[PDB]
Amino acid sequence: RTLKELERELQPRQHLWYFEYYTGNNVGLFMKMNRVIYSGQSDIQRIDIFENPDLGVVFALDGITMTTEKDEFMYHEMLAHVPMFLHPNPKKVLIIGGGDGGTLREVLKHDSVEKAILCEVDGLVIEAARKYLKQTSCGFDDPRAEIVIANGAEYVRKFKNEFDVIIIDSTDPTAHLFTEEFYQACYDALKEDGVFSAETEDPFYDIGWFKLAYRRISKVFPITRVYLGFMTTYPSGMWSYTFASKGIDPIKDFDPEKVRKFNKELKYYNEEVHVASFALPNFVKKELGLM
Amino acid sequence: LKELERELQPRQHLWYFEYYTGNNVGLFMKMNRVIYSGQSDIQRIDIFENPDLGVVFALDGITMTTEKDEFMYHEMLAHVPMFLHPNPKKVLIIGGGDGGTLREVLKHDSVEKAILCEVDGLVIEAARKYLKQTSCGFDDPRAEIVIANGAEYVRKFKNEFDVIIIDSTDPTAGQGGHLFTEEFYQACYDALKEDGVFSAETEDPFYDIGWFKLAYRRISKVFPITRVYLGFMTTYPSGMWSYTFASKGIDPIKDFDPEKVRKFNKELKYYNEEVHVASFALPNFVKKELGLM
Amino acid sequence: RTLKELERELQPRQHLWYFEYYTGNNVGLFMKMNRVIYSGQSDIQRIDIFENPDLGVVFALDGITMTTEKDEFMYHEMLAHVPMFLHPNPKKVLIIGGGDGGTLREVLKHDSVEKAILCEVDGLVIEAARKYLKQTSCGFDDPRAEIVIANGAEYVRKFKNEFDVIIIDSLFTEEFYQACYDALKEDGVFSAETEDPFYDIGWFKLAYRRISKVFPITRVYLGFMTTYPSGMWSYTFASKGIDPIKDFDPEKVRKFNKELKYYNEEVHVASFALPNFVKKELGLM
Amino acid sequence: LKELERELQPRQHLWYFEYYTGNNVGLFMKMNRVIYSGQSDIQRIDIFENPDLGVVFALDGITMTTEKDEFMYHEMLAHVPMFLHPNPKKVLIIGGGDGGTLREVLKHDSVEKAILCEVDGLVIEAARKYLKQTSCGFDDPRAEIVIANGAEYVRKFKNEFDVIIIDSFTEEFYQACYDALKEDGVFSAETEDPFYDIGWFKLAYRRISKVFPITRVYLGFMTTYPSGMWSYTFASKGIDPIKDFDPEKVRKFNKELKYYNEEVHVASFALPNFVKKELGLM
Incomplete structure (x- = not known):
């Protein structure tokens, strides 16, 4: 034998x-x-x-x-759908980080999308994801997806008034994707009515970075709002995301009907969760100075 | 030395x-x-x-419990039902020998008597000496600590309490535990007054999804109003904790008065008006598991 | 890319x-x-x-x-060389267990060997060793080596007055040891790893008792094993007359034409010196 | 409660x-x-x-230390040099705050005074209160416990000790030990495992051998120490570990020994080839 x-x-x-x-x-x-x-x-x-x-x-x-196959949907859906549904007609999207492909997969569920650029700093991450992480890398071959191997901070500054949505995922290290100038580059790369979301981690073990990210994003985007979601395998299980825009309010300009009539599968995100995610516990409000 | x-x-x-x-x-x-x-x-x-x-x-x-984050759990388990009741004077807490839930309940000035029913006397003694952050309310004149099995103790009462809260009890027994039976929930219903409210910790809908579903199902067979709410719990399994609110008519949303919370005269590190309402918004996977899609 | x-x-x-x-x-x-x-x-x-x-x-x-690449030589050399050097002219050898091949590798260093049978119960162990454990499985390619996939306790019973040396690199009953005795020739020798007299004191004592009831000469020897439980490993030498000390010729070891990273003439004799606690467990002193 | x-x-x-x-x-x-x-x-x-x-x-x-096996280490470190000395009366132990080595040294009736020099006072107090199995010799009238840095302490003596045991590393320190010993004094030091701590092992041997004319490494099993293979270095001004060993002294020993015996003493000096190669002895 x-x-x-x-x-x-x-x-x-x-x-x-x-x-x-x-x-x-x-x-x-x-x-x-x-x-x-x-x-x-x-x-x-x-x-x-x-x-x-x-x-x-x-x-x-x-x-x-x-990522974990059992729960990655919790993270990818909250990071992607909040800004995607808030934008009136998202056609051009830029995702920085997200080498696994999960965020790209969620973004591609929106029929309005014509081009979704996935900017990943490490080519080996893309190749490994393509071969071993099929659940999340399924969108790599979508004609609307364009994978670019580059430093997101350097890549985004090449564009001006180009994107409808910019999403900052968490797979790319930099010891650059979190400076005020980087956020300003994201702002400048977005169109007049563009939206933005960035994963801003747990306000527990990573409270220092959480506060820094919020402060820097808030110095650039007029509308900067933190939202929370469960993430069953990330540190503390309490994950934060920061929505930002040039005017679109995440609550006042939210249309629940767009979500209710959505033609794709959603395992976490829904209309009630969208609104609820913006309710911050007292300790988080205190850390951000929101009383 | x-x-x-x-x-x-x-x-x-x-x-x-x-x-x-x-x-x-x-x-x-x-x-x-x-x-x-x-x-x-x-x-x-x-x-x-x-x-x-x-x-x-x-x-x-x-x-x-953990000193850094126990407030997240105790505030959600206690304040949701306490603020929903019209005038909570008599409260029964089953489990939670650390005392955290009792501490939160005592913050409500309407409370005249709060009973903490713990099965293990050693937990109470250890909490007094080493868990002072949570056991600070043990000696409140309004508090009474009883060492007994909660399922047996609650049966001794009828039309007696305004609020009943079921904290942690026999974690190793899982869904087969004595404080998760329909008989026990019925005894709680019977021990409550006509307009009484109830809350129970119902585990994480991840590693303990079956237990979570069982608790909700059994509570719902007894109480006309049964609603799951969620909260972050940074050191509990998965970090996603569930609680089940139940009552004989009081709705957790339709009967919620934010002004009671805004004017509250005590410290709250997690709970607030927006969080109360938001906690009842369930993600799709949870709704599907409960048959609420 | x-x-x-x-x-x-x-x-x-x-x-x-x-x-x-x-x-x-x-x-x-x-x-x-x-x-x-x-x-x-x-x-x-x-x-x-x-x-x-x-x-x-x-x-x-x-x-x-x-096995670990850094120290497997300590175990394989002590298990194999003690009985191999004690035999007058070892030509036919049977190794039960040792799917990694280390013991076989050491046995094959002896030029007198004409046939060495490696009896391993798990064919997947042999295949994995051949592909990933080249340091120990290098002897698989030797023309004198024969790999047999079988249960050692059942396999040894098929032979009588056949082998010069039997090594147990892993199979614990008195009946099994008697079968090994019967499979050996009139002047055959035997060695078996008998674990650490610390966490596995129970097995250690049982193995010694059963082997000693079958073989006239039964002696425990010890060796360092830097990655095995406790670091104190025991082996049990057995024979039908050959004494591990009195019949040891150090010149065979001194003149050996192959590499030895642990075993030498001084270590051979020294390995038979047992600490008091071990002697007490075996009922010696 | x-x-x-x-x-x-x-x-x-x-x-x-x-x-x-x-x-x-x-x-x-x-x-x-x-x-x-x-x-x-x-x-x-x-x-x-x-x-x-x-x-x-x-x-x-x-x-x-471990209650189940500390005897293996303490007996090999102490008994090899103690039995090799003609009549050990004055002994100095550097380190060993647990007291195990002191306990073994005290088993020899010839000992009149044994000094235990530990650098950390808290170790001695913790051992006295919680490690009764090893600190049992703390109250022996022949024992003297001192809290000090062993490297500085040994310099106070010249031609004083019959035996010096290091239960805890410069050439200067080993020379101080040589000087503190009498003309026929013996020495022993734990020299770690020749596996994970091969570097320290080689260094200790080299430095000790540069001071003492007779330097020999011996090995012992230590079931809970890294690798389980522990080394010790014996040294003297003339006494040979094998040639001058009298097995009768061990056989007639009126005290309990759980590891050490006459055959183990001799066997411990037999070094495997890889150890000999690391020491340049092969």
């Missing part, structure tokens, strides 16, 4: 583990690994893709959990 | 590992020191210090 | 770990994993082969460490 | 992780209970209970 002929379904045991340390290295999440699908190193970072019995395929960058 | 001792600094050698349902995922926390470890005839108690979370209280290896 | 074109040398971090529990499940060893080379499941057990920054390639069966 | 407390039973939630040099491999242990956690101006002390190993003592996350 040959090697392949002798192989059987791999059963999970209690010897292989993935440890994700949170900011501060005092708390973290651990996951059992049934098998490791891919481990690669680029000039930028390390990529690991493995299988967990409960969460399915897990994608991590430098030991930080990026 | 004492003369040679200095401030204890954390290293990378002591850890607390918490396993979630299914045992495939969990949370780990660094321990600067173990404050107390005790074993009762019911369960094991461990209280330790984490550099970021502060004092952590665990029962049988399950995180119950 | 393509995947391979963008790939660089993989650097270890603090997120991937292998945890091995010792008997009792109260103590264990953990290792950082730079990458996992192979994970497979047979009808018998699970195989995992991964890379550790300090130990190199590590091979584990059901979460139990079997 | 007192009336409600019961026997504390172990679970799978409290753990001790000990990282080995390099931080790529380590040992983990279940902790049923933590007995003591303290911090001195020098280091952190942790004493806890493991279901299989019993009481475990760690310094800065490094395992120092």
Whole structure:
């Protein structure tokens, strides 16, 4: 009998583990690994893709959990649909980061989209996602999608009055995608009625960055509003996103009917959740100075 | 010893590992020191210090409270039903031996009597000595601590309470626990007055989706008004916690008066008027699981 | 570009770990994993082969460490060379277990060997070793080596007065040991790994008792094993007359024409010196 | 609380992780209970209970002693040089705050005075209160416990000790030990595992051999130390570890020995080829 002929379904045991340390290295999440699908190193970072019995395929960058098959929909739907539904007719979209493709997948559900550019700094992330993260990279081959390997901060400044929507995802490191000038470049790249959303992390372990991102975005966009969503495998489980625009109000200019009549599948986002996500608990309001 | 001792600094050698349902995922926390470890005839108690979370209280290896974030859980479990009741004077809290829910309930000036029914006396004694942030209301003149099984205790009353809150109880028993039966919920209904309200922690709709569904289903078979609300809980499994509000007529949205919250004379670190209403907005996957799509 | 074109040398971090529990499940060893080379499941057990920054390639069966590139020589040399050098002229050797091939590799270093049979119960272990554990499986290609996929306890019973040396690299009953005795020639020798007299004291004592009831000469020897539970490994030498000390000719070792990274004439004799606690467990002193 | 407390039973939630040099491999242990956690101006002390190993003592996350096997280390470090000396009366032990080595040294009736020099006073006090198995010799009239830096302390003596044991590294320090010893004095020092700590092992041997005319490495099993293969370095001004060893002294020993014996003494000096190669002896 040959090697392949002798192989059987791999059963999970209690010897292989993935440890994700949170900011501060005092708390973290651990996951059992049934098998490791891919481990690669680029000039930028390390990529690991493995299988967990409960969460399915897990994608991590430098030991930080990026996506989980069981719950990535929670994150991608909130990051993408809030600004997409708020825009009156989103045709040209720019997504910075999001090498896994999840945000692109959600953006492509909107029929108005004519072109969606996915700007990823690491080519190895795109190649690994295309081969091993099928659930999220399914939009890579869509004719409306254009994948560009570049630093988002450098790429966005090449455009002026070009995009309807700009979304900043979390897969791209920079030790650049969070400076006031970067947000100003995003503002300038957007059209007069353009909208924006950026993942702004957990107001718990990453409170310092959360406050900094809000402050910087607010210095550029007249409308800057934080919204929250559950993210069952991200640090603390309380994730924040920051919606921004040149005038469109996330509550006052929201049309629930657009969501109710939507012709695509949504596993998290809905009209009540859109409005509810903008309600901030007292401790978050205090951190942002919103009383 | 004492003369040679200095401030204890954390290293990378002591850890607390918490396993979630299914045992495939969990949370780990660094321990600067173990404050107390005790074993009762019911369960094991461990209280330790984490550099970021502060004092952590665990029962049988399950995180119950953390100093840094317990307010998120206790405020949502207590304030939703308390603010919805017209004039809550008599309140019964089952479980929650740490005292957090009692502390929040006592913030309401209308309260004349609040009973905390805890099954394990060792939890109460440990909370007094080591969990002062949550046990601060134990000695309030309006408070009464009773050491008994909640399912048996509640049956002794009829048309007695304005509010009944079911906090954490027997976490290792899961959905098969005594405080998750239709009989128990019916006893709660019977112990409540004609216009009484109720709230119960109903787990995370992720790792414990089945338990969550069972609790909602059984509560809904007893109370005419049953509504799930959600809240962040930064150190509980998945971070997405659910609670179930129930009543004999009072609607959590139609009968909510934001002015009661705006004019509240006590500190609130999580709960507010907007959060109250927002907590009842359920994501699609939750609605589908409850048959509300 | 393509995947391979963008790939660089993989650097270890603090997120991937292998945890091995010792008997009792109260103590264990953990290792950082730079990458996992192979994970497979047979009808018998699970195989995992991964890379550790300090130990190199590590091979584990059901979460139990079997071999590491950095120190496997310590175990394989002590298990094989003690009985091999003690035999007057070892020509036919039977190895039960040892699917990684390390013991076979050491046995083949002896020029007198004409045939060495490696009897492994799991064919997938042999295939994985051939493909991923070249350091230990290099002997698979030797014309004198014969790999047999079979249950060792059932296999050895098919032979009588056949082998010069029998090595147990893994199969614990007195009946099994008697079968080994019967399969050996009149002047045959035997060795078996008998675990650590610490976490596995129970098995250690049982193995010694059963082997000693069958063989006239039964002596325990010890060796360092830097990645096995406790680091104190025991082996049991047995024969039908050959004494491991009195009949040892150090010149055979001194003049050996092959590389030895652990075993030598001084270590051979020294390995038979047992600490008091071990002697007490065996009922010696 | 007192009336409600019961026997504390172990679970799978409290753990001790000990990282080995390099931080790529380590040992983990279940902790049923933590007995003591303290911090001195020098280091952190942790004493806890493991279901299989019993009481475990760690310094800065490094395992120092285990109730189940500490005898292996303490007996090999102390008895090899003690039995090799003709009549050991004055002994100096540098380090070993737990007291295990002192306990073993005191078993020899010939000892009149044994000085235990520990740098951290908190270790001595913690050992006296929580590590009774090893600190049992603290009150012996022949024992003298001093709190000081061993490197500076040994310099106060010249031609004073019969035996010097290092239970804890410059050529200058080893020369001071040589000078503190009498004309026929013996020496022993723990020299780590020739695996994860190969660098330290080689350095210690080189430095000791440059001072003492007779320097020989011996090995011993240590079931809870990194790799399980522990080395010790014997040194003297003429006494040979093998040639001058009298097995009768060990056979007639009127005290308990759980590891050390006459055959083990001789066997411990047999070094595997890889160790000989690292020491330049091959």
